[PDB]
PDB file of C-alpha atoms in Angstrom:
ATOM      1  CA  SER A   1     142.832  79.827 134.624  1.00 31.71           C
ATOM      2  CA  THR A   2     140.978  76.496 134.352  1.00 33.88           C
ATOM      3  CA  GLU A   3     138.077  75.945 131.933  1.00 36.96           C
ATOM      4  CA  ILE A   4     136.391  72.631 131.018  1.00 38.47           C
ATOM      5  CA  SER A   5     133.849  71.695 128.396  1.00 37.62           C
ATOM      6  CA  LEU A   6     132.028  68.509 127.450  1.00 35.72           C
ATOM      7  CA  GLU A   7     130.054  67.896 124.211  1.00 36.24           C
ATOM      8  CA  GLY A   8     127.725  64.975 123.440  1.00 38.98           C
ATOM      9  CA  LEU A   9     127.092  63.420 120.000  1.00 37.27           C
ATOM     10  CA  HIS A  10     123.752  65.250 119.370  1.00 43.12           C
ATOM     11  CA  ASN A  11     120.647  60.912 118.228  1.00 40.94           C
ATOM     12  CA  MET A  12     121.794  57.646 119.884  1.00 39.38           C
ATOM     13  CA  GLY A  13     120.511  54.176 118.960  1.00 38.39           C
ATOM     14  CA  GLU A  14     119.796  51.556 121.631  1.00 36.27           C
ATOM     15  CA  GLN A  15     122.654  49.197 120.747  1.00 33.53           C
ATOM     16  CA  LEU A  16     126.095  50.426 121.816  1.00 31.05           C
ATOM     17  CA  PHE A  17     129.463  48.889 120.973  1.00 36.26           C
ATOM     18  CA  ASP A  18     132.677  48.887 123.023  1.00 36.42           C
ATOM     19  CA  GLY A  19     134.668  52.053 122.414  1.00 40.19           C
ATOM     20  CA  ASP A  20     131.769  54.011 120.886  1.00 39.35           C
ATOM     21  CA  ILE A  21     132.436  57.655 121.666  1.00 39.80           C
ATOM     22  CA  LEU A  22     129.386  59.116 123.422  1.00 38.59           C
ATOM     23  CA  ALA A  23     130.796  62.493 124.425  1.00 36.53           C
ATOM     24  CA  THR A  24     133.945  64.581 124.055  1.00 32.41           C
ATOM     25  CA  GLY A  25     135.531  67.331 126.111  1.00 31.05           C
ATOM     26  CA  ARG A  26     138.606  69.453 126.692  1.00 30.06           C
ATOM     27  CA  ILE A  27     140.374  70.974 129.682  1.00 29.13           C
ATOM     28  CA  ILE A  28     142.165  74.301 129.195  1.00 30.22           C
ATOM     29  CA  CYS A  29     144.871  75.372 131.676  1.00 30.67           C
ATOM     30  CA  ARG A  30     146.281  78.888 131.250  1.00 29.11           C
ATOM     31  CA  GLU A  31     148.530  78.986 134.299  1.00 29.73           C
ATOM     32  CA  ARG A  32     151.699  76.870 134.670  1.00 33.27           C
ATOM     33  CA  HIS A  33     150.996  73.159 135.133  1.00 33.84           C
ATOM     34  CA  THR A  34     152.620  69.718 134.946  1.00 32.64           C
ATOM     35  CA  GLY A  35     149.401  67.883 134.061  1.00 30.34           C
ATOM     36  CA  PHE A  36     145.637  67.392 134.212  1.00 29.04           C
ATOM     37  CA  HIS A  37     143.210  65.600 136.509  1.00 29.01           C
ATOM     38  CA  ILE A  38     139.788  64.385 135.363  1.00 27.81           C
ATOM     39  CA  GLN A  39     136.957  62.489 137.068  1.00 27.21           C
ATOM     40  CA  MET A  40     133.353  61.713 136.272  1.00 26.56           C
ATOM     41  CA  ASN A  41     130.693  62.447 138.873  1.00 26.83           C
ATOM     42  CA  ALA A  42     129.041  59.049 138.584  1.00 26.45           C
ATOM     43  CA  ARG A  43     129.305  55.748 140.448  1.00 24.32           C
ATOM     44  CA  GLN A  44     132.642  54.124 139.722  1.00 23.09           C
ATOM     45  CA  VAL A  45     133.077  50.477 138.838  1.00 27.20           C
ATOM     46  CA  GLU A  46     134.565  48.728 141.899  1.00 29.31           C
ATOM     47  CA  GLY A  47     138.338  49.246 142.107  1.00 30.88           C
ATOM     48  CA  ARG A  48     138.620  50.453 138.469  1.00 31.16           C
ATOM     49  CA  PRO A  49     139.442  54.162 138.048  1.00 30.43           C
ATOM     50  CA  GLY A  50     138.154  55.588 134.750  1.00 31.76           C
ATOM     51  CA  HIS A  51     135.154  53.234 134.557  1.00 31.15           C
ATOM     52  CA  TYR A  52     131.678  54.365 135.510  1.00 30.48           C
ATOM     53  CA  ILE A  53     128.006  53.511 135.700  1.00 32.52           C
ATOM     54  CA  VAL A  54     125.800  56.424 134.593  1.00 31.32           C
ATOM     55  CA  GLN A  55     122.111  56.201 135.653  1.00 31.67           C
ATOM     56  CA  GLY A  56     119.045  57.431 133.718  1.00 30.22           C
ATOM     57  CA  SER A  57     117.631  60.927 134.313  1.00 32.10           C
ATOM     58  CA  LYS A  58     114.048  59.750 134.961  1.00 33.93           C
ATOM     59  CA  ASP A  59     114.442  55.938 135.045  1.00 34.15           C
ATOM     60  CA  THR A  60     116.866  55.014 137.863  1.00 34.49           C
ATOM     61  CA  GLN A  61     116.977  51.453 136.526  1.00 36.16           C
ATOM     62  CA  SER A  62     118.504  52.574 133.187  1.00 35.00           C
ATOM     63  CA  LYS A  63     122.283  52.222 133.478  1.00 34.90           C
ATOM     64  CA  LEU A  64     125.069  52.980 131.054  1.00 37.04           C
ATOM     65  CA  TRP A  65     128.521  51.465 131.401  1.00 37.18           C
ATOM     66  CA  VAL A  66     131.081  53.956 130.222  1.00 37.62           C
ATOM     67  CA  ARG A  67     134.804  54.693 130.402  1.00 33.25           C
ATOM     68  CA  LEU A  68     136.949  57.838 130.246  1.00 33.13           C
ATOM     69  CA  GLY A  69     140.233  58.508 128.505  1.00 31.88           C
ATOM     70  CA  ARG A  70     141.646  58.959 125.025  1.00 31.60           C
ATOM     71  CA  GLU A  71     145.455  58.925 124.962  1.00 27.47           C
ATOM     72  CA  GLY A  72     147.749  58.797 128.033  1.00 25.67           C
ATOM     73  CA  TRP A  73     145.646  58.781 131.194  1.00 23.69           C
ATOM     74  CA  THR A  74     146.445  56.701 134.298  1.00 24.92           C
ATOM     75  CA  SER A  75     145.357  55.653 137.826  1.00 26.47           C
ATOM     76  CA  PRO A  76     146.905  57.792 140.600  1.00 26.36           C
ATOM     77  CA  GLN A  77     139.365  58.094 142.636  1.00 25.15           C
ATOM     78  CA  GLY A  78     139.967  59.921 139.306  1.00 25.33           C
ATOM     79  CA  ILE A  79     142.445  59.534 136.447  1.00 26.80           C
ATOM     80  CA  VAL A  80     145.507  61.596 135.471  1.00 25.34           C
ATOM     81  CA  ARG A  81     147.498  62.784 132.419  1.00 27.85           C
ATOM     82  CA  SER A  82     150.876  64.560 132.135  1.00 26.67           C
ATOM     83  CA  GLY A  83     151.553  67.618 130.011  1.00 26.85           C
ATOM     84  CA  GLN A  84     152.519  71.270 130.059  1.00 23.90           C
ATOM     85  CA  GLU A  85     150.522  72.069 126.896  1.00 25.27           C
ATOM     86  CA  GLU A  86     147.525  74.367 127.120  1.00 22.06           C
ATOM     87  CA  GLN A  87     144.811  71.727 126.614  1.00 23.52           C
ATOM     88  CA  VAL A  88     143.894  68.030 126.436  1.00 25.63           C
ATOM     89  CA  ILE A  89     141.095  66.202 124.680  1.00 29.74           C
ATOM     90  CA  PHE A  90     139.246  63.383 126.445  1.00 27.93           C
ATOM     91  CA  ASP A  91     136.447  60.956 125.525  1.00 28.47           C
ATOM     92  CA  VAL A  92     133.549  59.271 127.308  1.00 28.06           C
ATOM     93  CA  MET A  93     133.065  55.846 125.728  1.00 26.00           C
ATOM     94  CA  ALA A  94     130.712  52.901 125.878  1.00 22.39           C
ATOM     95  CA  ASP A  95     132.370  50.344 128.159  1.00 17.82           C
ATOM     96  CA  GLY A  96     131.750  46.988 126.444  1.00 18.85           C
ATOM     97  CA  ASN A  97     128.795  46.151 124.161  1.00 19.30           C
ATOM     98  CA  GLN A  98     125.411  46.965 125.684  1.00 18.63           C
ATOM     99  CA  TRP A  99     121.746  47.649 124.979  1.00 19.03           C
ATOM    100  CA  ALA A 100     120.753  50.962 126.569  1.00 19.57           C
ATOM    101  CA  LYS A 101     117.180  51.549 127.684  1.00 19.80           C
ATOM    102  CA  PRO A 102     115.812  54.626 125.888  1.00 15.70           C
ATOM    103  CA  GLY A 103     115.877  57.947 127.721  1.00 15.75           C
ATOM    104  CA  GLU A 104     118.256  60.621 128.905  1.00 15.61           C
ATOM    105  CA  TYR A 105     121.719  60.313 130.352  1.00 15.60           C
ATOM    106  CA  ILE A 106     123.605  63.225 131.903  1.00 15.74           C
ATOM    107  CA  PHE A 107     127.399  62.988 131.749  1.00 15.72           C
ATOM    108  CA  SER A 108     129.052  65.155 134.388  1.00 16.46           C
ATOM    109  CA  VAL A 109     132.820  65.601 134.481  1.00 15.98           C
ATOM    110  CA  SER A 110     135.157  67.653 136.715  1.00 15.00           C
ATOM    111  CA  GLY A 111     138.762  68.686 135.987  1.00 12.25           C
ATOM    112  CA  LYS A 112     141.795  70.137 137.814  1.00 14.60           C
ATOM    113  CA  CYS A 113     145.130  71.482 136.550  1.00 14.35           C
ATOM    114  CA  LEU A 114     148.113  69.912 138.322  1.00 12.09           C
ATOM    115  CA  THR A 115     150.717  72.207 139.938  1.00 12.26           C
ATOM    116  CA  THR A 116     144.941  72.293 146.860  1.00 10.98           C
ATOM    117  CA  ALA A 117     143.390  73.098 143.448  1.00 12.17           C
ATOM    118  CA  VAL A 118     139.900  74.226 142.372  1.00 11.68           C
ATOM    119  CA  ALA A 119     137.955  72.037 139.926  1.00 11.18           C
ATOM    120  CA  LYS A 120     135.451  73.195 137.318  1.00  8.79           C
ATOM    121  CA  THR A 121     132.548  70.948 136.178  1.00  8.50           C
ATOM    122  CA  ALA A 122     130.987  70.475 132.738  1.00  8.00           C
ATOM    123  CA  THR A 123     127.918  68.459 131.784  1.00  8.21           C
ATOM    124  CA  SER A 124     126.397  67.071 128.607  1.00  9.88           C
ATOM    125  CA  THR A 125     123.209  65.128 127.986  1.00 10.63           C
ATOM    126  CA  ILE A 126     122.725  62.168 125.671  1.00  9.54           C
ATOM    127  CA  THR A 127     119.353  60.819 124.536  1.00  6.52           C
ATOM    128  CA  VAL A 128     118.966  57.127 123.687  1.00  6.86           C
ATOM    129  CA  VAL A 129     116.139  56.994 121.156  1.00  5.75           C
TER     130      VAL A 129
END
């Protein structure tokens, strides 16, 4: 009914630029729907849906400022896109220029199909070398 996948770039450098795609995913809905919901399981930037701070896997102090969205997403805690089509593509991007501490960053994203729904989660890891 509802399947979600997320795929990293798979050899990051330390210097990131605004908009740099760090990961890509899709949501598939096979039952009738009017749209898609997507959210990242990460701390959100204050009052700004779609924008997140991802922490390091072993470092705590290592942070990555990142945003969701590709085409037509919007603020309704989570962001939303309309469509009856079977699937959407979405991107996780570097939010402004930044210098990432080396290490590992786990992106974790959950999605719903829009008709009280059940969300599936997908995760991808990036390594800043």
